[PDB]
From Swiss-Prot:
Regulatory subunit of the ATP-dependent BRF-1 and BRF-5 ISWI chromatin remodeling complexes, which form ordered nucleosome arrays on chromatin and facilitate access to DNA during DNA-templated processes such as DNA replication, transcription, and repair. Both complexes regulate the spacing of nucleosomes along the chromatin and have the ability to slide mononucleosomes to the center of a DNA template. The BRF-1 ISWI chromatin remodeling complex has a lower ATP hydrolysis rate than the BRF-5 ISWI chromatin remodeling complex. Residues 9-113 form the Bromo domain. The chain holds residues 2054 to 2166 of 2168 of the full protein. Component of the BRF-1 ISWI chromatin remodeling complex, at least composed of SMARCA1 and BAZ2B, which regulates the spacing of histone octamers on the DNA template to facilitate access to DNA. Within the BRF-1 ISWI chromatin remodeling complex interacts with SMARCA1; the interaction is direct. Component of the BRF-5 ISWI chromatin remodeling complex, at least composed of SMARCA5/SNF2H and BAZ2B, which regulates the spacing of histone octamers on the DNA template to facilitate access to DNA. This is Bromodomain adjacent to zinc finger domain protein 2B. Belongs to the WAL family. It is found in: Nucleus. Expressed at varying levels in several tissues, whereas a smaller transcript was expressed specifically in testis. It comes from Homo sapiens.
Length: 115
C-alpha cells in the first residue's frame, strides 16, 4: 500500500529473455501454422469467429517496439495464439496437434526461465 512495498524483483533481463524464448518458438518445426497472420480474405469463418487474432510475427513486432508493459502481457499473447488454434481446429488435425505441441514447448521454457 502507500509507502509499503514488497522487495524489488529484478526485471532488467525480461526483454532479452522473452526475445530468446520467442526465437526458440519461431524456429521449432511445428511453428508453421503460427508464423504469420491468418489470411482473413482466404479463410472462411476466421474473421467472425476469432475475435482477437494473434501470431508470432505480430508478437515479435510488439516486443521490438515496446508494446508489452511486462512479461505477463507477453505470455497472454503467446497463449492467445494457442487458444485461437484450439477454437478453430480439430485436436486430430496436423494444425491442432501443432498447437498442443507448441503450447507444451512454450510452458516449459516459461517455467524454467522465470519460476
Amino acid at each position: 500500500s502507500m509507502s509499503v512495498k514488497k522487495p524489488k524483483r529484478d526485471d532488467s533481463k525480461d526483454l532479452a529473455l522473452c526475445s530468446m524464448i520467442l526465437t526458440e518458438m519461431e524456429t521449432h518445426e511445428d511453428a508453421w501454422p503460427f508464423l504469420l497472420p491468418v489470411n482473413l480474405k482466404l479463410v472462411p469463418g476466421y474473421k467472425k469467429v476469432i475475435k482477437k487474432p494473434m501470431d508470432f510475427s505480430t508478437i515479435r513486432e510488439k516486443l521490438s517496439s515496446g508494446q508489452y508493459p511486462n512479461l505477463e502481457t507477453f505470455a497472454l499473447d503467446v497463449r492467445l495464439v494457442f487458444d485461437n488454434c484450439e477454437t478453430f481446429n480439430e485436436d486430430d488435425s496436423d494444425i491442432g496437434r501443432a498447437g498442443h505441441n507448441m503450447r507444451k514447448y512454450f510452458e516449459k521454457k516459461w517455467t524454467d526461465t522465470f519460476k
